[PDB]
Design a protein around this ligand. Structure first.
Ligand code: Y1O
Ligand code: NAG
Ligand code: NAG
Ligand code: NAG
Ligand code: NAG
Ligand code: NAG
Ligand code: NAG
Length: 335
């Protein structure tokens, strides 16, 4: 309803670019945060219509402008060139705070789906620390649901609406370009992936009860959304997930159709230079990869899915606002 401000442990000393941006965009985190439980009250929320999401989106666009400058930016006919140094890039958590006269209501219901009424409600000055992690298909390094896997959607019957799966247990994904210089790969332990998809299939089954639940790779589109794309220490990884979203959940049981090897699914990745931008319609060109071993060890904490008897789910993404919603879903600004 108003304009928020951000708070962070960004440090002076870092040249890591999230730290720099936060040092002159945010105020320091309050060591002593106040929170007010009101477990009787009940109010409504709508994670799909939440202007904290737009405010954070604009912040992260600004952060990426200042921090990950492309050598060339193409928007339509016009090309902007500027220096594109390699930088140290590691997202840090950001808190969104309501200014004087306003508060932030947090919904305390462990299983709240992001929509409708919520009984146990607190009031706080700032959100928890949210790392602004840009990615598609898999949500990385978020915070897990406390109880059961949660299915979030603006409208589950409308198959054009992105589904956000909030995981209650993280799944490790290690992606590495080892010492082709654009060849990389990610390793996921097939045991845990098997489990979490068994559980996601269970919850989806509750919402589509007659049907068989199939997971399948992304149909089509730009590489950014048909692969699991993300930024790892400045470099843009594009990781094939057809061995990942590839399985059937039938009779209360999940069976993985994807191919593994000695207990691990391995995704084949490329580090790319020409990027379809998430900030706006346009292209960005960056310099070739830094040297040595580029490795990110991340937690998968959620999924972005799109629904096509049988119901069929494929990985989605492309609108980074859904990434922010997945963390902001339980907050509302008031007063
Ligand atoms: C939600 N389904 C609709 C949909 C599908 C696809 C997209 C949108 C929307 N976009 C949108 O809403 O912009 C507000 C985008 C429009 N930009 C464009 N065409 N150049 C596009 N997304 C990306 O291009 C994208 O994510 N690139 C990407 C780059 C670097 C990394 Cl590390 C990364 F992880 C991802
Ligand atoms: C979320 O809960 C509301 C009721 O609180 C319900 O109307 C809506 O259909 C639910 N959505 C999902 C995706 O479960
Ligand atoms: C996570 O959610 C699933 C189903 O939503 C449930 O079976 C499981 O017990 C939950 N908690 C875990 C695995 O810790
Ligand atoms: C979502 O589903 C359809 C759109 O396909 C329509 O009835 C309406 O927009 C929504 N329905 C409900 C029950 O929310
Ligand atoms: C992923 O790999 C499979 C098999 O290697 C291939 O058929 C598919 O086209 C790839 N997807 C993308 C988006 O490159
Ligand atoms: C699942 O993986 C197998 C083996 O990698 C592949 O042949 C198949 O095409 C994948 N499934 C789908 C629906 O693409
Ligand atoms: C996720 O967090 C870990 C630990 O901070 C970090 O090493 C990793 O690179 C992060 N992943 C991404 C994609 O930022």
């Amino acid at each position: 309803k108003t304009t928020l401000f951000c708070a962070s442990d960004a440090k002076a000393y870092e040249k890591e670019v999230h730290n720099v941006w936060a040092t002159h965009a945010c105020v320091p985190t309050d060591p002593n945060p106040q929170e007010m439980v009101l477990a009787n009250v009940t109010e409504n929320f709508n994670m799909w219509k939440n202007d904290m999401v737009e405010q954070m989106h604009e912040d992260i666009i600004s952060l990426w402008d200042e921090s990950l400058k492309p050598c060339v930016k193409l928007t339509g006919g016009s090309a902007i060139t500027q220096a594109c140094p390699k930088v140290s890039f590691d997202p840090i958590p950001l808190h969104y705070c309501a200014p004087a006269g306003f508060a932030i209501l947090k919904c305390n219901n462990k299983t709240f789906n992001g929509t409708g009424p919520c009984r146990n409600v607190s009031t706080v000055q700032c959100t928890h620390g949210i790392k602004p992690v840009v990615s598609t298909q898999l949500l990385l390094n978020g915070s897990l649901a406390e109880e059961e896997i949660i299915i979030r959607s603006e409208n589950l019957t409308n198959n054009a609406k992105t589904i956000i799966v909030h995981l209650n247990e993280s799944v490790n994904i290690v992606c590495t370009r080892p010492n082709n210089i654009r060849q990389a790969h990610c390793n996921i332990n097939e045991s845990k992936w098997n489990n979490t998809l068994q559980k996601v299939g269970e919850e989806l089954a509750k919402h589509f009860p007659s049907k068989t639940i199939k997971f399948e790779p992304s149909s089509g589109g730009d590489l950014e959304i048909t692969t699991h794309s993300f930024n790892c220490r400045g470099e843009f990884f594009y990781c094939n997930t057809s061995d990942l979203f590839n399985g059937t959940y039938r009779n209360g049981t999940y069976n993985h159709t994807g191919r593994s090897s000695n207990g691990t699914i391995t995704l084949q990745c490329k580090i790319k230079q020409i990027i379809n931008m998430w900030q706006e319609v346009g292209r960005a060109i960056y310099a070739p990869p830094i040297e040595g071993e580029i490795t990110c060890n991340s937690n998968i904490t959620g999924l972005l899915l799109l629904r096509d008897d049988t119901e069929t789910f494929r990985p989605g993404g492309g609108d980074m606002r859904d990434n922010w919603r997945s963390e902001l879903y339980k907050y509302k600004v008031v007063e």
